[PDB]
């Protein structure tokens, strides 16, 4: 019993490795990969060699079986080097989570096991061109036909979308539109080299450019029935359960970037002089740095709180959607100010802050937008007060 904001010595050594790899191996090439938009293979394989990926995978599948808290402290470190590469290797926990929380013993040793053996990627495919936020407007259809299902439709904006061995796939099970969302969807494990599957060209976004993102079209795609997650209609619970353990990690990503923004702006502010003084001697700039420091520290704790709640067996929807909304928001505030403090140089493409502004905007959109986070928080909040 007792509040503690101090890590286990085990977590310290994790953080130290995560951080050695971030400063040493990611940063020195992170602009290079943002420029070419090439998928960062050597780093993903290194991170996998270091044990920094697939961290949730349980021990009985050759995993480490580690907490949400550990992922978060790790991934804050990777993000600090680059959110493009952090997102890439984060895509794995995303695709894996349903299987970890909803898969049977063969499903688990099959699709989780292989991640333990080579460095393969997986992705989570839910979003479609007509629905992202309104997950319950997914229209990718899935029909039972004997010993298997026939998946037809189109998925958009999928991380590792063209780089994945296999997919978590959520699809509309029931044609009845009166069907409750909670029971209307099935979720699958869907190998990527299945016939019918058409991965699209690389999507060119403003930010996190080296991460792989693309549309996928499913036509008449045969999915073996023993890869259904729990049953028919079950998918929606499954997909929603996942977030508890992944939203904290996305938030932890954002602070990574915010911390980077803060350090870059603080170093420059100690070098650049204007009107005969360092920028830090300009009260407005100190005020700025103070506030950035405030926003980072609270953002950090917030994701730390959400990671602890789920790690404690409790569910964390309230705290996690707090962390994502705030982290997302302050990552952006911090990116622009870092640009601003750097000034003309900050707006230029050989300084490292401009990338952060472009990388940052994503955090107010994927993994649940700033608006739908506030509906989630508002709903959990309101419920605490009603009978």
């Amino acid at each position: 019993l007792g509040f503690s904001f101090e890590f286990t010595e085990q977590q310290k050594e994790f953080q130290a490795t995560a951080r050695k790899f971030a400063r040493e191996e990611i940063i020195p090439v992170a602009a290079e990969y943002d420029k070419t938009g090439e998928y960062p293979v050597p780093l993903i394989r290194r991170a996998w060699e270091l044990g920094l990926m697939n961290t949730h995978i349980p021990e009985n599948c050759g995993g480490l079986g580690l907490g949400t808290f550990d992922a978060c402290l790790i991934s804050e470190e990777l993000a600090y080097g680059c959110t493009g590469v952090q997102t890439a290797i984060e895509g794995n926990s995303l695709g894996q989570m349903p299987i970890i929380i909803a898969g049977n013993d063969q499903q688990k040793k099959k699709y989780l096991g292989r991640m333990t053996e080579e460095p393969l990627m997986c992705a989570y495919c839910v979003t479609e061109p007509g629905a992202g936020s309104d997950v319950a407007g997914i229209k990718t259809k899935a029909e039972k036909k004997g010993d298997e299902y026939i998946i037809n439709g189109q998925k958009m904006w999928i991380t590792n979308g063209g780089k994945a061995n296999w997919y978590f796939l959520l699809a509309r099970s029931d044609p009845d539109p009166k069907a409750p969302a909670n029971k209307a969807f099935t979720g699958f494990i869907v190998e990527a080299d299945t016939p019918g599957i058409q991965i699209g060209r690389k999507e060119l976004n403003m930010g996190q450019r080296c991460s792989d993102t693309r549309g996928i079209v499913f036509e008449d795609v045969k999915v073996p029935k023993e890869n259904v997650l729990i049953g028919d209609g079950a998918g929606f619970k499954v997909a929603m359960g996942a977030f508890d353990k992944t939203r904290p990690v996305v938030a932890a990503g954002a602070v990574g970037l915010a911390q980077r923004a803060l350090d870059e702006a603080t170093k420059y502010a100690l070098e650049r002089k204007t009107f005969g003084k360092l920028l830090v001697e300009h009260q407005a700039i100190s005020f700025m740095l103070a506030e950035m420091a405030m926003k980072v520290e609270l953002a950090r704790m917030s994701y730390q709180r959400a990671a602890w709640e789920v790690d404690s067996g409790r569910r964390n929807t309230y705290y996690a959607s707090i962390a994502k909304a705030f982290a997302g928001d302050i990552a952006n505030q911090l990116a622009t100010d870092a640009v601003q403090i750097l000034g003309g140089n900050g707006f230029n493409t050989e300084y490292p802050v401009e990338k952060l502004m472009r990388d940052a905007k994503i955090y107010q959109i994927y993994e649940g937008t700033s608006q739908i986070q506030r509906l989630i928080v508002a709903r959990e909040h309101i419920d605490k007060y009603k009978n």
Binding site: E271, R272, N345, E350, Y351
Partner: protein, 313 residues
């Protein structure tokens, strides 16, 4: 105390190591017959030079085959064996690899705490050194029966190579120890980033054929050759040499900025060089702030004049 001092010479290919003159200077601060031990296989060549040197009462000579490659397992009892016969207060050397290797073993044999790399001397029991990659200055009141320490070379001046004349006695003997043996050697214009001595030219050189003057000197300082982004862009040099924000971040011992205005973007690639030189004719040139040392002067007169103050020294 009746306080004699003793400098351990360092030397090779019949030549005294410069850092030894710097150590002899520091020795004289303590006040007391600087005796200096020259050990090795072909001593006297070098022992004759020490005799001409300024401040050296005795030149103790220890010639033995066994000292090939000056191993600190041999020279340690050599040094204790003098110390028994003379009872010095002080025993030191230049803080080179030779000096650094030898002296702490001597301490351990004498059972005194030794002091590394001194840069000043408040007195015979009080020395000043640097710690935390030189981010602090620590000061030590050693109280040992024997004071054992090495000396940062460029913290002191080389005393006159000629000047005083000094007696030279045969040193006391040791028995070959033969738990170590020297085998071999290999000696050496570096790659830019790994180096410890960088020269760089800005736009003020005016051409790439003009960079001969910077090589001229970066063979005297067995040194690396970089440039600004404005020297690269003007066609002078290729891209893999640009020091700065878009180029190779460096921070060696010695950085020479030649004709470099010193824009914040170039200072970002090297304000962490330990030591920074600034030759630039404009006096209000941003580069001066960050340079420990510099002159308001034409580089075509000052630089080829420096390569001629290091052909000899």
């Amino acid at each position: 105390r009746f306080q004699s001092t003793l400098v351990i010479a360092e030397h090779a290919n019949d030549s005294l190591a410069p850092i030894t003159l710097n150590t002899i200077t520091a020795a004289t601060r303590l006040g007391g017959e600087v005796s200096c031990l020259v050990a090795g296989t072909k001593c006297d060549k070098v022992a004759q030079d020490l005799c001409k040197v300024a401040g050296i009462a005795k030149v103790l000579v220890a010639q033995h085959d066994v000292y090939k490659g000056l191993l600190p397992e041999e020279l340690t009892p050599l040094i204790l064996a003098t110390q028994k016969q003379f009872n010095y207060t002080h025993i030191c050397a230049g803080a080179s690899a030779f000096g650094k290797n030898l002296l702490p073993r001597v301490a351990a044999k004498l059972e005194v705490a030794p002091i590394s790399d001194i840069i000043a001397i408040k007195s015979p029991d009080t020395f000043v050194r640097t710690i935390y990659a030189g981010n602090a200055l620590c000061t030590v009141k050693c109280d040992e029966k024997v004071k054992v320490f090495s000396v940062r070379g460029t913290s002191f001046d080389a005393a006159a190579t000629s000047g005083g004349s000094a007696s030279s006695e045969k040193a006391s003997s040791t028995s070959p120890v033969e738990i170590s043996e020297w085998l071999d050697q290999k000696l050496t214009r570096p790659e830019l980033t790994g180096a410890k001595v960088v020269v760089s030219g800005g736009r003020g050189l005016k051409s790439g054929e003009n960079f001969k003057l910077l090589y001229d000197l970066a063979d005297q300082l067995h040194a690396a050759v970089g440039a600004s982004r404005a020297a690269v862009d003007a066609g002078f040099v290729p891209n893999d040499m640009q020091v700065g924000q878009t180029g190779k971040i460096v921070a060696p011992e010695l950085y020479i900025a030649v004709g470099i205005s010193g824009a914040i973007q170039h200072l970002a690639g090297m304000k962490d060089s330990k030591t920074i030189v600034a030759i630039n004719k404009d006096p209000e040139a941003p580069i001066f702030q960050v340079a420990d040392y510099g002159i308001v002067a034409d580089l075509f007169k000052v630089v080829p004049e420096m390569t001629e103050i290091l052909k000899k020294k």
